[PDB]
Design a protein around this ligand. Structure first.
Ligand SMILES: OCC(CO)N[C@H]1C[C@](O)(CO)[C@@H](O)[C@H](O)[C@H]1O
Length: 664
């Protein structure tokens, strides 16, 4: 009753929603629609209007003031000018005098001009009027978000161990490499549950293989780690290497499971392995074949995965390569100065992730060929879906760790996401912060960023501040690019400061796991912008560098270099809490209004809301060992907290034994 659906043309069924909504008959209820130059929705915003949403996209929480294009892209440079990152999350909310929600169920290039051209004008446009638009009504943005979360279906739920801390690097290759990470962390009593495995663990970058020479008895090594409560999380790429004798490739060709050129030949894209083919992620039989392959790793005791390059990323195609070589030939023997070095540089740049390549291959959906650009934003989504559905077949009772880079709304049912290739920049702490609530509004609650920054060289202080935000993000992983300064916590002086910040995480795991489960089982948000919780407060609704978590706390991480604190605004009385590096917990009551708070490098801050309290465990070195029996309660007198807690492994969500009321 709160959701109407408007149809334009013959839209590809993305399966984004699980609720079937009938097609409305009356005219579009807001602004104006035009099909003159493709498709365009135009709306004149009131000056006080705020615009939420777009999930994984650039800039702030209020999206007003720039331009966002849904077009999944491999871009390792996340600067303010970028219009397109990895995800496509076409859900927005206009909040103000007139308030309403919109979801553009369209799987291709979609442009959100939100006050870029004219500050008062919101304009969403695409090439083809072949889409469903859902209009969602309600009193406020929060109401509308909850309506939407209901119809897209329950969010993905990770195993409890994934709320531990994870260490990762593009470069870990041998057993010696992984053992050193284990030793570096455990010997220094820094808590940890996960070590990620990047593409070097494969045999020659081949999906669903393991380097035979480095890991002769992989199941043994996996258990060697697991016995220490270190679960190895291997990566899987979208591209399957072209190689004679390689089983995955042979089957994909023989059974026509790969994306094809117009003429029926299997499309070639270069990635890590060199020439590869793409599994036809929109072909259900192809999906099943690919997803079933994960069994190869699961049978070896692997309990989680990350899916990468699944935009799909293309270094070059065979068509592009030949073009670039021809141009290079001309450049080489041009004596007259008619071909400048800049044009050569432009060509080499042009053949990477080229929109022309995305026009060169097709998906086979029930016998029907569909050109990949028309359904581009659905690829990563269906790769992860392929994996998720297979987990359900392979072991229906068990939760697997699973997250992806590229995504579309709907994938939030099968896996989480990580925010891709960020940089060791202080401004990226704020970016990690702001993306969170938006991703929540779109179903994606298991998310986080590469802590310490992925690209470039990080510093000791930048890593510590990142980690202090990571404490609260369900995915909490330190990841680094190749050749960068080493980002492991044991590569810095005074290691005890890192142990203190990560101990903060572990002490909070029962409370953090708790709020996540409750929000996921109730189609609610784990992070909320302050305006969702304090709608009547004009100052609160514009705060962009603080977030509410569940119904108990607010976070305010430090994101300026050399800062010893930050300004915060409290919309009500709260208790300012800091996890101190000696193991103690400091408490101060701060009243409603503006404050400056001191937060040192080795201190983790949070606020506890009036009338609320939270449980805090003693610090433990892995998730299994956290003592949840008689936990300390921090916060206000006379208040209570409802703790959720299950075995963290299976899917038995609806039991009264999972709930425990704690009273301070
Ligand atoms: O976008 C492509 C590159 C750029 O470094 N990064 C991707 C590949 C990768 O470098 C090796 O597997 C991996 O470590 C990154 O996490 C991933 O985003």
């Amino acid at each position: 009753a709160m959701i109407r659906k408007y149809r334009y043309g013959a839209p590809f069924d993305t399966e984004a929603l699980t609720e079937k909504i009938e097609t409305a008959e009356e005219a579009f209820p807001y602004g104006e629609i035009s099909q003159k130059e493709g498709f365009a929705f135009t709306y004149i915003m009131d000056e006080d209007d705020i615009v939420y949403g777009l999930g994984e996209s650039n800039r702030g929480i209020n999206k007003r003031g720039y331009c966002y294009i849904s077009n999944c892209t491999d871009d390792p440079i996340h600067t303010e000018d970028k219009r397109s990152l990895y995800g496509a999350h076409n859900f927005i909310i206009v909040s103000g005098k007139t308030t309403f929600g919109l979801f553009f169920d369209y799987p291709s290039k979609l442009t959100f001009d939100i006050g870029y051209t004219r500050m008062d004008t919101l304009k969403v446009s695409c090439e083809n009027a072949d889409l469903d638009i859902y209009v969602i009504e309600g009193e406020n943005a929060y109401d509308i978000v909850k309506q939407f979360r209901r119809v897209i279906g329950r969010s993905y739920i990770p195993p409890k161990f994934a709320f531990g801390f994870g260490q990762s690097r593009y470069g870990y290759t041998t057993k010696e490499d992984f053992r050193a990470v284990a030793k570096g962390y455990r010997e220094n009593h820094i808590p940890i549950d996960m070590i990620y495995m990047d593409i070097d663990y494969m045999q020659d970058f081949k999906d669903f293989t393991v380097n035979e020479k480095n890991f002769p008895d992989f199941p043994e090594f996996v258990k060697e780690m697991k016995d220490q409560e270190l679960r190895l999380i291997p990566i899987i790429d979208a591209g399957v290497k072209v190689e004679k004798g390689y089983e995955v490739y042979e089957e994909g060709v023989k059974n026509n499971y790969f994306c094809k050129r117009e003429d029926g030949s299997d499309f070639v894209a270069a990635v890590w392995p060199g020439d590869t083919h793409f599994p036809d992620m929109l072909n259900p039989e192809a999906r099943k074949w690919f997803g079933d392959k994960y069994r190869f790793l699961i049978d070896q005791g692997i309990e989680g995965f990350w899916n990468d390059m699944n935009e799909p990323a293309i270094f070059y195609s065979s068509e592009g390569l030949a073009e670039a070589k021809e141009f290079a030939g001309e450049f080489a023997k041009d004596t007259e100065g008619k071909i400048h070095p800049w044009a050569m540089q432009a060509k080499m740049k042009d053949i990477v992730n080229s929109p022309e390549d995305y026009k060169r291959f097709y998906h086979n959906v029930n016998g029907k060929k569909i050109r990949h650009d028309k359904v581009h934003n659905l690829f990563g989504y269906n790769m992860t879906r392929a994996a998720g559905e297979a987990f359900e077949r392979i072991d229906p009772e068990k939760r697997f760790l699973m997250f992806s880079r590229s995504s579309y709304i709907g994938m939030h049912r099968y896996g989480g996401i990580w925010m891709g290739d960020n940089k060791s920049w202080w401004s990226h702490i704020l970016l990690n912060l702001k993306m969170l609530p938006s991703l929540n509004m779109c179903g994606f609650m298991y998310t986080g960023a590469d802590l310490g920054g992925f690209g470039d060289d990080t510093t000791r202080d930048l890593l510590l501040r990142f980690l202090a935000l990571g404490v609260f993000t369900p995915l909490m992983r330190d990841h680094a690019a190749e050749g960068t300064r080493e980002q492991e916590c044991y590569q810095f002086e005074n290691i005890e400061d890192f142990r203190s910040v990560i101990n903060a995480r572990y002490r909070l795991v029962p409370y953090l796991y708790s709020e996540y489960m409750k929000a996921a089982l109730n189609d609610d948000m784990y992070f909320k912008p302050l305006g969702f919780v304090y709608p009547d407060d004009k100052m609160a609704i514009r705060v962009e560098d603080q977030l509410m978590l569940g119904n108990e706390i607010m976070i305010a991480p430090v994101y300026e270099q050399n800062a010893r604190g930050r300004y915060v605004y409290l919309p009500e009385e709260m208790k300012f809490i800091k996890f101190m590096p000696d193991g103690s917990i400091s408490e101060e009551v701060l009243e409603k209004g503006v404050h400056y708070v001191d937060v040192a490098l080795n201190e983790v801050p949070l606020f506890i809301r009036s009338g609320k309290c939270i449980p805090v465990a003693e610090a433990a070195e892995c998730v299994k060992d956290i003592d949840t029996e008689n936990m300390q309660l921090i916060g206000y007198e006379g208040s209570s907290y409802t703790l959720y807690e299950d075995d963290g492994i299976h899917k038995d969500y609806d039991k009264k034994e999972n709930y425990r009321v704690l009273t301070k």
